[PDB]
Amino acid sequence: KKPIAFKVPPNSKLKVTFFGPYNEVITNVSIINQLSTPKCQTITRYPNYTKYETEVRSLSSC
Ligand SMILES: [Cl-]
Ligand SMILES: [Cl-]
Ligand SMILES: [Cl-]
Numbered sequence: 001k002k003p004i005a006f007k008v009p010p011n012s013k014l015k016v017t018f019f020g021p022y023n024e025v026i027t028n029v030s031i032i033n034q035l036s037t038p039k040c041q042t043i044t045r046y047p048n049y050t051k052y053e054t055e056v057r058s059l060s061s062c
Contacts, residue, residue, distance in 0.1 A: 003042035006054065008033035013057045018049040034059060 008014045008031050018026040026047050033039045 001044070001046065003044045004046070004052070005040055005042045006031060008039050008041060009056055010036050010038060011059045013059060015055040015057060016043065016052050017055070018046060018052050020050050032059065 006014055006016065010033060012033055014031045014033070016029045016031070018028070020026050026049055029043055029046065031041045031043070033041075
């Protein structure tokens with residue numbers, strides 16, 4: 001299980017969803033970036049997975 005690297009856009013939360021063979025959600029992890037510049041972060045712990053997808057959400061007020 002090598003690290004997987006992700007670029008988190010400025011002022012955002014990146015949500016990574018791991019999926020299995022039947023398109024089922026295994027788990028989710030997330031990474032915040034409060035900075036005004038993009039930032040790379042690695043995920044080193046994760047379950048066995050078939051694929052992942054990512055989503056970006058804003059850290060602005062709700
Ligand atoms: Cl970016
Ligand atoms: Cl970061
Ligand atoms: Cl991690």
